[PDB]
Amino acid sequence: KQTGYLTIGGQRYQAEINDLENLGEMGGQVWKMRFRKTGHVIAVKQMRRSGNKEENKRILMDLDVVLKSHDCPYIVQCFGTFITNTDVFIAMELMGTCAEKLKKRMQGPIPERILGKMTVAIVKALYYLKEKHGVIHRDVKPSNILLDERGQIKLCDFGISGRLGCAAYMAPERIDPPDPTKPDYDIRADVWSLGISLVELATGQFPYKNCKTDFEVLTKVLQEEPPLLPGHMGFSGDFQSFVKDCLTKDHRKRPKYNKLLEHSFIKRYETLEVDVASWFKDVMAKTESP
Numbered sequence: 001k002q003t004g005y006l007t008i009g010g011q012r013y014q015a016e017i018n019d020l021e022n023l024g025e026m027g028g029q030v031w032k033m034r035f036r037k038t039g040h041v042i043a044v045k046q047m048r049r050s051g052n053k054e055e056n057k058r059i060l061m062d063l064d065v066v067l068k069s070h071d072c073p074y075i076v077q078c079f080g081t082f083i084t085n086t087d088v089f090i091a092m093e094l095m096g097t098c099a100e101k102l103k104k105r106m107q108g109p110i111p112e113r114i115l116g117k118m119t120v121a122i123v124k125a126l127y128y129l130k131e132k133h134g135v136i137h138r139d140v141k142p143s144n145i146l147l148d149e150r151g152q153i154k155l156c157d158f159g160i161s162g163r164l165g166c167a168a169y170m171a172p173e174r175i176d177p178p179d180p181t182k183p184d185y186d187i188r189a190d191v192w193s194l195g196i197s198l199v200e201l202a203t204g205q206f207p208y209k210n211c212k213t214d215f216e217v218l219t220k221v222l223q224e225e226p227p228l229l230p231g232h233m234g235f236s237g238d239f240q241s242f243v244k245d246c247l248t249k250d251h252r253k254r255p256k257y258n259k260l261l262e263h264s265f266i267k268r269y270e271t272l273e274v275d276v277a278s279w280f281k282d283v284m285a286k287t288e289s290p
């Protein structure tokens with residue numbers, strides 16, 4: 001009724017409503033709140049018992065994954081849940097923004113060094129989901145890639161439980177498949193989506209911006225060469241090779257995450273020191289919101 005529990009930084013706290021400052025909306029119903037006992041600002045989501053049955057099923061399936069992903073550094077964490085007679089309140093790690101909004105703020109390219117660190121994190125998150133929990137994400141795109149002012153990069157909880165349109169990020173083998181009732185693709189389609197995401201964020205241009213309809217984009221995916229990084233922006237050979245491998249059109253030759261994690265681009269950005277935190281803070285201070 002009056003007391004819940006938040007676990008943050010390996011410590012459990014009692015939390016009554018007086019311990020939390022409502023700081024308003026995030027960019028479903030979710031509030032930014034500051035926990036006065038620690039200074040953390042967290043996200044609190046409300047799932048109403050009377051809510052839409054599909055939206056609630058999605059929230060519960062995503063939460064179930066988040067709860068059992070406490071050992072993955074690259075997935076947003078849950079700090080607690082509070083159940084009342086009429087509602088469920090879910091306390092989540094609050095990130096600063098997604099990569100889609102970051103591109104919009106940047107009005108252009110995001111630097112390769114940031115994208116390298118992003119790639120490492122997001123591949124490891126997707127690989128973790130598949131290996132540990134059997135989850136094929138199926139919706140890899142910039143809006144699901146989160147960053148914060150601590151320099152962390154993490155996969156969003158939304159849809160983290162997988163399937164249970166984005167023609168833009170659809171792999172060729174997903175376009176006119178034999179049985180879309182039994183859509184039996186694997187993680188390689190998400191590898192393609194990651195590649196498209198990286199080109200979009202690196203160039204500040206979605207590779208199919210000039211298309212006027214969803215069907216048009218699918219024609220381009222099939223008919224055109226893969227939309228590789230351009231050569232006029234100073235991208236490393238490693239980055240260019242990584243994106244080329246992700247955007248292998250024939251899925252039978254497209255690498256899986258385990259192979260991608262061996263790639264020179266990933267090994268490089270594992271060791272390179274990149275101050276993502278300071279960079280992110282600079283962006284957020286020089287730019288406006290939506």
Ligand SMILES: C=CC(=O)N1CCC[C@@H](n2nc(-c3ccc(Oc4ccccc4)cc3)c3c(N)ncnc32)C1
Nearest residue numbers: 004005006015020022031044046080081082089090091
């Ligand atoms: C100041 C905000 C406030 O009142 N609000 C705004 C938001 C919707 C409403 N709300 N929120 C809570 C609530 C419940 C829990 C929690 O933190 C947890 C603590 C431990 C684990 C998980 C979460 C934060 C707020 C809440 C509630 N208890 N009862 C009714 N409406 C509520 C009205």
